[PDB]
Design a protein around this nucleic acid. Structure first.
Ligand SMILES: C[C@@H]1CN2c3c(cc4c(N5C(=O)OC[C@@H]5C)noc4c3F)CC3(C(=O)NC(=O)NC3=O)[C@H]2[C@H](C)O1
Ligand SMILES: C[C@@H]1CN2c3c(cc4c(N5C(=O)OC[C@@H]5C)noc4c3F)CC3(C(=O)NC(=O)NC3=O)[C@H]2[C@H](C)O1
Ligand SMILES: [Mn+2]
Ligand SMILES: [Mn+2]
Ligand SMILES: [Mn+2]
Ligand code: NA
Lengths: 189, 482, 481, 189
DNA sequence: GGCCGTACGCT
DNA sequence: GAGCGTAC
DNA sequence: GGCCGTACGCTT
DNA sequence: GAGCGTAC
């Protein structure tokens, strides 16, 4: 489950999406509980660009997010109900943490597209160590990634939907061939 | 705080994951046929002195070593790979020697790693042979705290020997295991003919050779695999029809296809019987024991045609299965779809390099050792002056200097003299130095021969391959039927 | 063959009961450790996990302790180590952990894959002089390792960190204490063998829980220090303060030892829901890594907050008893001890340790002195030494010629044959002579210590005092009345 | 989970109560599947001498044995419903394995007492040493503990029921004092 | 100690 | 009486 | 990565 | 198909 912000006021409250349960637990003990809620993600989540809507709506991870954001999905998405003004993607600084990052953005882009425009969606900058989020201290996690003071955030910005449509379909889509070709063409070894 | 584009984020972050999975997780290098986790485990077993002669070590500590040192991933990813390498129904040439429960063909897993121990197999040592003779290129580990190899010397052709399955991103791989004897014979043929055709190579390598044995129907699927890198191959179980008494008959299955879970496969046959989707089966019994080996028994109803029930079990259950050959490996740190000869070529080239580098390294060490021995000879010949000079000196620096001036010794030669123990002054000891010098000089000469002629080096590769084939090559397990 | 059930039951159970007692659940009275702890520490030692060196993956530590000494579940090993790293558990923590190691809210530690540890500075004091024949080693389970039967334990760890364990036929429960007060009590004891518990309690007031708190009364502590069994009322540090507008609140900042803060908070909230406690409007935990423990109970306006507090004492673990049962291993036997017996057994252990260490340093000095005497002779008559060697065809012959001609021991002679040539230079010869002279003063100093029973003891008191000065800290737990 | 044998003939069959799942897995491969059934026991089992009957009955471990043995218990025990003529306790050769023994024998003597008197209960004897059952191979577990041709099972007997009652009550009862005295009377350090 | 989610490609 | 802490 | 069983004793 | 085998 999600640990929520004591504060009732959506305007000031932020939710961290944390990769892994060890990172989640440490995050909880470190965060300023007034305005920071913590929803852990157990590993890779679902690649919606390849899944049919019945599977999507049955996914625990996907369902915990829909719940927590409380804004409905697709057609039924209304910004007004948003329970947090800052939604933060907090993953490891590894290739897997980048995978999970691209997964969450696929979900956002295909279901809560409205939310990206509104720029409530952010990407944490954890220590680019060899260490991961589950191996750090809560005070190390606090003042490096969470303390509203000495933290830096990348606010996610969409600026061409036609470009974004083709990209999400090529990378996260079911046709392997096109994905194989984008690797072939941009990969530098 | 600054912003970030979403199309740019997706492309960059996705390309990082993809290349990584491709070049550093899912695919084997053409040369040693190992994925990273595999290479690290064997290297780990090597750096912990876990060789066949040595006692078994708790798997917990093996995995923990490999985890903290070279492989910064979850522990089950390590342990499970190490358990695969230890099973004779998984690896045509097992690389790990495990003690405790390490599973079965029924798909029952291995016990958790605190219940098991491991060490290398003797064939593994061939993968590691001469790793410490500047044969392969090392690199820094993740935490920049350790060194790990980029590839193993791999004295036998391991990519085709054990084969590979691996799901990358944008591509996957599937290479079936082979008979090591046939594989090396192939290399020996190719070595004495750079222009050999796949057709010729097939006269050594008949085709896959699975640890679980069984049959392969037709040479055609194999030929397509070997010429293009892709082809479907038909794996059939070894089953016969025999009497059970009272004029009734049964089917007896003794070898099931590769990578097919036995348990699941039997439950499938059971399903077809409840579901009434096949007729004539009265009993299904797994009589497999550690002493019988695999034995699935299917009792046919009296006056039903068993041969017909059999051909339907092939069509309807994993009793017959396909192996989808898709030979992708890392070739110069890039994924390439290779054919049989391409694979054998990249391998033999590697051996030439490994043996060349080893011979070079050995020459540096011999030439360096001979240099010291010349200095020691000089010292023993002029010992009374040597000793005087040293006692006269107040520092190393001064003694070094004098020795170098009086006898014309190199800096390294002088250093070796000062490090000499008194016991090396006895009469017997001097003569030993002479012998060692003489043997070394022979050795240096032999080594120079090898480097001087590309042909001689290659014959040595041939000769060392021939020894592995003689020591480790076995009979073909899988029958190839026409 | 055939076997009688009454005989099998009696022998199977006795095998188990004895084992749990002397090799699992009860601490040894000398180092205050149960086997699993001793092994985690000895492991950290053997693996060179010292406070200066960087932190090591917990998995690898656990794995080595499991492979070499402690052939039991990995979880039983890790959770014990985790306890040793928590400042709310150990009055003087023995493990220095990096990563998530839990909190007072009963949130466990992250799995061992995700945590790193090394030993604390004070743990160095437990292993000080381990490799100086101070304590008897023993064969392990696979006969492939040696392990310490007990640790040197250069501070009185049994009472400092306390001990709790459930055995079979018994259990133990010893509270932590203040290290400054214990050491002051051992020094007191060291100068008066006949000291009463009462006089010792002038140094050791009572327990000192890492979680601070209040102890109500002195009489439970007196009964415990005198019989070894007793009950101690621990109470939370609560105050009543105005929260503004005529309204008030209860702020709790210290909780009883061994009480899960979270479970305690839910326990109140459940009393409030079920209307079985009157006057509470809100319950917030405002505890931060920055503010300290802070549990606020808001009190409905014009209610009596001093009554609510008293009732929260009566119904929640906001007040709890600690039940003392000082059973430790004494000569590997389970034994109920009082405050004095605990400190008697400890001081003895510290004497034997300082003796055995001095005794071992002496042997190693005499050994090395004898070698240098050998090398000095060679330097003196170097020409003849060289000759006798050169004129020998085998090292065996040289060894015997060397022993005959210069009246050297076999050890002195081997030493000389091993001597590299660079040891004949000016400075290398001087280093030898200089080593010898420094070494002779040392031997005289060591034999001094072993010559008088009182010099040995003063050295013990001096090494305790040094530890007290570097490690002793202020009391945490208030003992009211 | 019980792995049954082939023959449904009680007369010719035997059941192995094994300590631990890893030993469960090992045992099932090494056995003769036609005559040897294996029922794993996950650790220490309920001490029935200390527990309440409602609990003793609704306990997974305690229940699973009733099913497997299929003979009912207490007043309702049918000596003849037994599905195995050999009930073998297979525990580690260490103190914890010996505790699990005392626990099982407590269970039987109280709920299936006729079974012992029948001599259906047997104690295996796995190789003595520092290796547990879980740590061994399936072939070494067979050839040393399970194989009729080289095994040394110890059949359980009771000469006396009165002394056996005071024994199970003193060792496994909830009066700790009687238990504590027995140790001090018998312990050899 | 086991039971369980996901990605990824291929057939 | 309840949950403390090493075990399987 | 978490979830969960059990034995064992206890404050005069 | 769903399961081959490294990842979280
Ligand atoms: C940390 C765990 C605690 N254990 C649990 C056990 C059982 C359960 C358990 N159970 C349950 O709830 O129903 C069935 C079973 C009795 N839930 O959580 C448990 C453990 F953590 C028994 C245990 C096991 O899991 N497997 C064994 O073979 N041996 C053991 O001693 C044991 C294991 C070895 O370690
Ligand atoms: C061997 C296991 C496999 N994993 C499973 C995961 C998830 C599940 C899982 N479930 C899930 O994700 O939602 C529903 C269901 C309970 N069932 O079994 C699982 C794992 F084995 C994801 C996993 C985890 O357990 N927790 C993490 O924080 N990160 C991970 O990568 C992961 C862990 C680290 O390792
Ligand atoms: Mn990571
Ligand atoms: Mn002299
Ligand atoms: Mn055991
Ligand atoms: Na088929």
């Amino acid at each position: 489950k999600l640990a929520d912000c004591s504060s009732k006021s959506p305007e000031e409250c932020e939710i961290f999406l944390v990769e892994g349960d060890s990172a989640g637990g440490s995050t909880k003990s470190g965060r300023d509980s007034r305005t920071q809620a913590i929803l852990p993600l157990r590993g890779k989540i679902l690649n919606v660009e390849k899944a049919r809507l019945d599977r999507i709506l049955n996914n625990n991870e996907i369902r915990q997010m829909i719940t927590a954001f409380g804004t409905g999905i697709g057609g039924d998405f209304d910004l007004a109900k948003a329970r947090y003004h800052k939604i933060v993607i907090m993953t490891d600084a590894d290739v897997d943490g980048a995978h999970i990052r691209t997964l969450l953005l696929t979900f956002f882009y295909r279901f809560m597209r409205p939310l990206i425009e509104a720029g409530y969606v952010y990407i944490a900058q954890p220590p680019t160590g060899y260490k991961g989020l589950g191996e750090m201290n809560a005070d190390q996690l606090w003042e490096t990634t969470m303390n509203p003071e000495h933290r830096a955030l990348l606010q996610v910005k969409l600026e061409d939907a036609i470009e974004a449509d083709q990209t999400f379909e090529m990378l996260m889509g079911d046709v392997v061939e096109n994905r194989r070709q984008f690797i072939e063409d941009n990969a530098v070894y | 705080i600054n912003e970030r584009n979403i199309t740019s984020e997706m492309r960059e972050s996705f390309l990082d994951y993809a290349m990584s999975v491709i070049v550093a997780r899912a695919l084997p290098d053409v040369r040693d046929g190992l994925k990273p986790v595999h290479r690290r485990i064997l290297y780990g077993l090597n750096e912990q002195g876990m060789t066949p002669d040595k006692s078994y070590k708790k798997s917990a500590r093996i995995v923990g070593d490999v985890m903290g040192k070279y492989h910064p991933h979850g522990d089950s990813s390590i342990y499970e790979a190490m358990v695969r390498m230890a099973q004779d129904f998984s690896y045509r040439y097992p690389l790990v020697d495990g003690q405790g429960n390490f599973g079965s063909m029924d798909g029952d897993g291995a016990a958790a790693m605190r219940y098991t121990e491991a060490r290398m197999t003797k064939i593994t040592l061939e993968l590691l042979r001469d790793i410490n003779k500047d044969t392969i290129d090392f690199i820094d580990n993740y935490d920049g705290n350790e060194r790990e190899p980029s590839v193993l010397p791999a004295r036998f052709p391991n990519l085709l020997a054990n084969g590979a399955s691996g799901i990358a991103v944008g591509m996957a791989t599937n290479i079936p295991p082979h008979n090591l004897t046939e594989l090396i014979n192939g290399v020996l043929s190719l070595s004495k003919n750079p222009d050999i055709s796949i057709a010729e190579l097939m006269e050594d390598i008949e085709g896959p050779d699975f640890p679980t044995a069984g049959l392969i129907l037709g040479k055609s699927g194999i030929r397509r695999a070997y010429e293009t890198g892709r082809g479907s191959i038909q794996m059939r179980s070894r089953a016969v029809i025999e009497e059970r008494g009272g004029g009734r008959q049964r089917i007896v299955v003794t070898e099931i296809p590769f990578q097919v879970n036995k348990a699941r496969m039997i439950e499938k046959i059971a399903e077809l019987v409840r579901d009434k989707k096949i007729d004539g089966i009265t009993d299904l019994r797994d009589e497999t024991s550690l002493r019988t080996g695999v034995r699935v028994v299917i009792d046919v109803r009296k006056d039903a045609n068993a041969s017909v029930i059999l051909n339907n079990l092939y069509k309807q259950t994993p009793l017959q299965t396909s192996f989808g050959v898709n030979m992708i490996a890392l070739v110069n740190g890039r994924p390439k779809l290779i054919n049989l000869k391409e694979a054998l070529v990249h391998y033999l080239e590697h051996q030439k390099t490994v043996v060349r580098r080893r011979t070079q390294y050995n020459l540096r060490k011999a030439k360096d050792r001979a240099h010291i021995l010349e200095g020691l000879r000089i010292a023993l010949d002029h010992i009374d002056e040597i000793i005087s000079t040293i006692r006269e000196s107040d520092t190393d620096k001064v003694a070094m200097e004098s020795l170098q001036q009086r006898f014309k010794l190199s800096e390294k030669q002088a250093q070796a003299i000062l490090d000499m123990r008194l016991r090396r002054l006895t009469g017997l000891e001097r003569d030993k130095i002479e012998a060692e010098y003489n043997e070394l000089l022979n050795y240096i000469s032999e080594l120079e021969t090898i480097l001087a002629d590309e042909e001689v080096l290659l014959q040595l590769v041939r000769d060392e391959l021939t020894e592995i084939r003689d020591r480790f090559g076995d009979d073909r397990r899988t029958e190839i039927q026409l």
